[PDB]
Amino acid sequence: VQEMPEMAPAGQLPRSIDVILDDDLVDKTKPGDRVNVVGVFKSLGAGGMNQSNSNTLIGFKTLILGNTVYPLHAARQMLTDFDIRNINKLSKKKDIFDILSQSLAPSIYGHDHIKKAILLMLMGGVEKNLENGSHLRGDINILMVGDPSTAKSQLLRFVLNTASLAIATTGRGSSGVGLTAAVTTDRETGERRLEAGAMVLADRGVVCIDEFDKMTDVDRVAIHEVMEQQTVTIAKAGIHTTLNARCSVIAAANPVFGQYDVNRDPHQNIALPDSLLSRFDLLFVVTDDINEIRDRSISEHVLRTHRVTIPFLRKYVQYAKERVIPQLTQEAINVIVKNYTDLRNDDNTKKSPITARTLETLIRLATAHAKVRLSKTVNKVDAKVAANLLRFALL
């Protein structure tokens, strides 16, 4: 067990001790859980007075033989009839998608296209696996880019506080993002194990990494396979193993040539390989133009921050991750194909060309949008938010 690296004041790296448990609580702790344990303290082994020549060698391995491993949250969220009925009463209004948007980040103005996109992504959409067939990309993977110091990196880390067991990395240039590279450490003298780097934690969770263009070539081939394919398989020095992972990235990058996002090609703009650009959908370009009422309003909201709520918000999504999935309305599927074929003929006569897989977005956004409604019917109103959200991402 490491140290929780926030209440340990920085004068040292995190230390560690270890614990031997028994049969009742095995396979209970995933790597990356805020665990709480309590047991006896115990030394064992012989040391210092063994037969000869044990000079300056410690001989008391500190161990813990313990019980009652407790997870904490700072899956266990119990709720009575009262609070479960309030969210039924808070499923009633025709505005709750708009109230939940601005009730998320109470420090930054605007970007309601962005502020709806995060909550739409974080709750996530379903993947109906094909019987004797390849399932499709039931995850969702959004991307941002912006001219610098426009809070493009601010909102990426407060999703980690309400993560619901989604611990992300920071994107450091190392191989191990989704692999092991045969790290075994002999597994107590003679056993070889494939200890997972960062995909045993991302399963049914979210990750976020920074500085996409500011990497070497190793991660570029690494995010190639693990996006088009749900899993990874490797025999580094051992055996092939197809371990699965349901994950979804959150990206961030910066344009290189300063303030050039208007005078040049809007595409080919950062020239990281467009296989990833094709495998992502939403490429928001954050604008920061000068409006004299905008910055004036900005100047006070940075002053009133030196002093409908969060735990109700996280309970809502982690209850709405376990309910029904409609997928079906024979006329809501009719309006969207009219809503695509026009811009399928208005893709080259505009800025961005689209592809056929973009149609699978247009169901998937509205699929989770009905999950906000908590209803077993695909409605009609979902095919209007999915339209104009793309219309801002494309115009």
Binding site: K128, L130, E131, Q327, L328, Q330, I333, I363
Partner: protein
């Protein structure tokens, strides 16, 4: 249409098991026909018909 059901019933074709033509490929593999002489009397100038248009 593929998301309403969990199948692809389309294109009005009676689907065939892949073992059938797998045998027919193996059944064709027990034939190996030998060419006649009428073919190369005509394809010799078909190459000539393929000659000047690329050289045009």
């Amino acid at each position: 249409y593929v998301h309403m059901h969990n199948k692809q019933p389309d294109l009005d074709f009676t689907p065939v098991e892949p073992s059938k033509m797998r045998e027919y490929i193996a059944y064709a593999k027990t034939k190996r026909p030998v060419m006649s002489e009428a073919v190369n009397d005509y394809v010799v100038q078909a190459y000539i018909r393929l000659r000047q248009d690329s050289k045009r």
